[PDB]
Structures are given as C-alpha cells and as structure tokens.
Design a protein around this nucleic acid. Structure first.
Length: 88
RNA sequence: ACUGAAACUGUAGUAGAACCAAUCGGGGUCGUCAAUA
C-alpha cells in the first residue's frame, strides 16, 4: 500500500491544480516490487488485525527503597518542535 | 500514579488592458587650384 500510495502521489501543497508542487515521493526500500506483490495478491488479503494497547506488566520484585538517592541528570534537546499541551 | 488519538493551510482567481517604431530628406551635382619674387 505505502509503495503504491507513494507512487500515485503527484502533487502537494498550495495551488496543486494550477501546476505548483509537482513531485516524486519515494520510500527507501519500497519499489514496484512492493506494488507488484499487491497487484499479485490483493484479492486474498483480509482485514488487518485488531489494534490493542501495549499493556504494563509488574513483577513486584523491586527491593525496598534505601538511601542514598542518586540524581541522574537528563539533558533534553528539541530536534523538531514539541507540543506539550498547556490547554486545548 | 504513566506522552491522547486522528486532521494536506488548503480551495477559486490568465500579470493584464491600451499604444503604428514612427516623422523630415530627388543618389544628387561645375569652377579653378596654389603663393610667391
């Protein structure tokens, strides 16, 4: 699908219909081979599997807390913009 | 005591209307030339 949908993309952005934004969109490692497999196989696909969350697990085997504390500093650098909701 | 999810800044719109690269001009026709001794 992703190979196929990438291939069919011809335009993005503003004034697509008036010749802005003509493009090729290619995934690394998806080719017409991935397209051809779907063409060969799409009739025998089914529904995708149902989504479920990754649940937490607990053993309870931690030792009881004892001093001293350790303070491990973590430096965070933003690489994209980051949205941290104050109010929606 | 626990990151929400998902959502194309897109959609319509002719850098165009107007403006003469033009106005005037017979491919024509006659007197010397030179300055010393």
């Amino acid at each position: 699908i992703l190979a196929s949908g990438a291939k069919l993309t011809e335009r993005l952005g503003g004034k697509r219909r008036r010749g802005n934004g003509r493009c090729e969109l290619k995934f690394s490692g998806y080719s017409d081979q991935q397209i051809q497999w779907l063409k060969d196989n799409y009739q025998s696909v089914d529904q995708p599997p149902k989504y479920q969350q990754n649940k937490l697990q607990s053993a309870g085997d931690n030792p009881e807390q004892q001093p001293p504390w350790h303070i491990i500093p973590l430096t965070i650098k933003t690489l994209s913009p980051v949205v941290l909701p104050a109010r929606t």
